[PDB]
Design a protein around this ligand. Sequence first.
Ligand SMILES: N#Cc1ccc2c(c1)c(-c1ccc(C(=O)O)cc1OCc1ccccc1)nn2C(=O)c1c(Cl)cccc1C(F)(F)F
Ligand SMILES: N#Cc1ccc2c(c1)c(-c1ccc(C(=O)O)cc1OCc1ccccc1)nn2C(=O)c1c(Cl)cccc1C(F)(F)F
Lengths: 262, 261
Amino acid sequence: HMESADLRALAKHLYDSYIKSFPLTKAKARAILTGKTKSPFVIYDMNSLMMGEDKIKFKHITKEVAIRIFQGCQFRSVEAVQEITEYAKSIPGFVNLDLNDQVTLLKYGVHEIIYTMLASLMNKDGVLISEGQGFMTREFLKSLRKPFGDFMEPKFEFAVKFNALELDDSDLAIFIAVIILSGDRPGLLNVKPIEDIQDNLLQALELQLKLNHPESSQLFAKLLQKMTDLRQIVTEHVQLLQVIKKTETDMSLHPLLQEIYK
Amino acid sequence: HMESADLRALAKHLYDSYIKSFPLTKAKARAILTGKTTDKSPFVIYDMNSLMMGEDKIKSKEVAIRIFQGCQFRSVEAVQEITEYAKSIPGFVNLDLNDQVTLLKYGVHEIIYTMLASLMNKDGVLISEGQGFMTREFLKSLRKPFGDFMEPKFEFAVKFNALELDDSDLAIFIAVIILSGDRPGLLNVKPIEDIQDNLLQALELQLKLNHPESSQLFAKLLQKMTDLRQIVTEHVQLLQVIKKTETDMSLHPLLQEIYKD
Ligand SMILES: N#Cc1ccc2c(c1)c(-c1ccc(C(=O)O)cc1OCc1ccccc1)nn2C(=O)c1c(Cl)cccc1C(F)(F)F
Ligand SMILES: N#Cc1ccc2c(c1)c(-c1ccc(C(=O)O)cc1OCc1ccccc1)nn2C(=O)c1c(Cl)cccc1C(F)(F)F
């Protein structure tokens, strides 16, 4: 169906575009998390949060602290959506799809991709922020009041298991493309070219994982099994947000801000 | 990890055990559903009157309850058939005993949905070992919550059935579902994953040999193991709500144990 050279070309194409599209790759994030490269500024409690937003001055972080961090996660997610959207245009065939289907694939895909790429920034002890210039501890995030603490912890829980696959950026670039080209998103008009592109991406991912992880038994199957979960986690996620909206009233934004985050 | 001759041997073993464990294969269900055979034709239940004729042909409760209890009775038998099949999977009975219980507890429902599809087409489902056929339309028109309890099974089945898997494919697929290392509370994840790795390898080769023109059927089938997780969760959220409303219903103790947490 496809030749190995075409699959390697597709894989290289996607890695290159993935490098241009996302500000902090997994390779650089890991160097920061491990201690293998200016230490990031560490946020571990209320006082160090206050110094970090007065020193680094995070555009997301800057009345109650738990609310402020939660909304900072939203600000960054909105940024990620545009980065993923630009990445999608580099996937071969994507821009030739019907315009409504492009929108639909992005609309229902970004949540899964944001979770996936968040893991690249996370270890069991915390998460990089502001392009790796800061590090906020898991314990500080989990200890936020209300439901905000239990909103943060499931991301870490997923990340630790996903990170045990030890995927690198060239693996992730194809994996992310596969998620986008999901022919079962609701309301798609023309499923057939979407599945045709996804089939080529899956062949590419399969070959990429055998060449890059030749000792990792059935990694391909295990990664698709993670694409199973991601569906669940995302559904859990939206049910968490809606509960927050109906319970909390200290969370009103300028109506324009609400529209941006709609 | 395993060689192809070993993978083909595992596939044949599993298909043999599957035939021995499940009385109504997909091959026989399809022969019944397709027809042009006088001897295998089912009696079709499509409304209240034909249900009552069916009990005098195929062989005090409100109709939706009676149908619902028929589903439970057969689900319990399915659990029994799946348990018997599971013990034939190499390595399964050598696992920690608590993990065997745990794998069955979280696996039977996903398997029941998978094998229910074999009995289904877009118009209804085989019952009574294929002697009867109850229409989708009749099931969906049951009152209360029972009508919409039936329909999602059909929605999954029409999509799963588009893969056109036969029984030798399904025997390996079902084994993979059972040997899932991510079930909550497992004690020894690694020996389960080691078994699943061999079953996945076996499934991969089996689908390439049996569906050589079916591009990426392996990946599409594992993606189906996605939905199944969703369907099962919707199922229990319906089943519990029904439990809280209806008391003319009692669940079989085997099923009761499975749904606890
Ligand atoms: N620790 C943690 C934590 C917890 C919940 C989170 C996130 C982080 C993030 C997130 C995603 C991507 C990136 C990135 O740099 O690539 C950075 C992120 O946060 C950095 C950050 C950490 C600490 C305080 C402020 C910001 N997103 N998010 C969501 O909740 C989320 C998700 Cl996963 C998917 C879709 C939509 C959303 C959201 F809109 F609702 F936010
Ligand atoms: N159409 C349809 C329909 C709809 C809901 C159903 C079922 C069928 C079945 C079921 C499962 C396996 C088999 C089999 O022959 O292998 C047969 C089945 O039904 C046949 C049949 C249909 C109509 C009237 C009488 C019998 N089970 N079930 C459940 O609801 C179910 C499930 Cl999936 C898992 C666990 C527990 C349950 C239950 F206890 F709650 F019932």
